[PDB]
Design a binder for this molecule. Structure first.
Ligand SMILES: Cn1ncc(-c2cc(Cl)cc(Cl)c2)c1CC(=O)N1CCC[C@H](C(N)=O)C1
Ligand SMILES: [Zn+2]
Length: 140
């Protein structure tokens, strides 16, 4: 589990969105596994606006933050799960690192701010849904 709290927005994995998230919906995209809902309180996270390929992510199944090198956001084939059929997920970055089901939502960050959240994993790989291109998260 986990979310990014930037301005009056809450960014979560779409597959983990609550009824309150859907009832206060700002934007969602199944192909990216992302959903953004509105919040009453202002958040403290800042979004990175950069092309960093190195950062640190939070792994809840180890209570640890790990430094990683990650690929550029791309279209990648993801196997079937209880949440989606096997399909291509867009804006996904891969890295070598531990991840289990339950680790989705962990933040990946670089020197500039939040880069994205854990969305996929398996056998020593971890995949992050990028949010750096969502410029509108910084305003309104
Ligand atoms: C986060 N994580 N880390 C490891 C595994 C994983 C490991 C094993 Cl052994 C078996 C399975 Cl089915 C999954 C997962 C879960 C995962 O990748 N997904 C399930 C939730 C929706 C995700 C999506 N974005 O499509 C895909
Ligand atoms: Zn950066």
């Amino acid at each position: 589990s986990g979310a990014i709290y930037v301005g009056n927005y809450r960014v979560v994995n779409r597959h983990l969105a609550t009824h309150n998230d859907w009832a206060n919906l700002v934007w969602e995209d199944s192909s990216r596994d992302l959903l953004v809902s509105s919040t009453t309180a202002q958040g403290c996270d800042t979004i990175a606006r950069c092309d960093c390929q190195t950062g640190v992510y939070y792994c809840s199944s180890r209570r640890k933050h790990y430094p990683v090198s990650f690929s550029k956001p791309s279209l990648i084939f993801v196997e079937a799960s209880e949440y989606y059929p096997a399909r291509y997920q867009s804006h996904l970055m891969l890295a070598v690192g531990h991840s289990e089901p339950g680790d989705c939502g962990g933040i990946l960050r670089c020197q500039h701010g939040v880069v994205g959240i854990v969305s996929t994993g398996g056998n020593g790989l971890v995949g992050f849904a990028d949010v750096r291109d969502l410029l509108w998260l910084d305003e309104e």
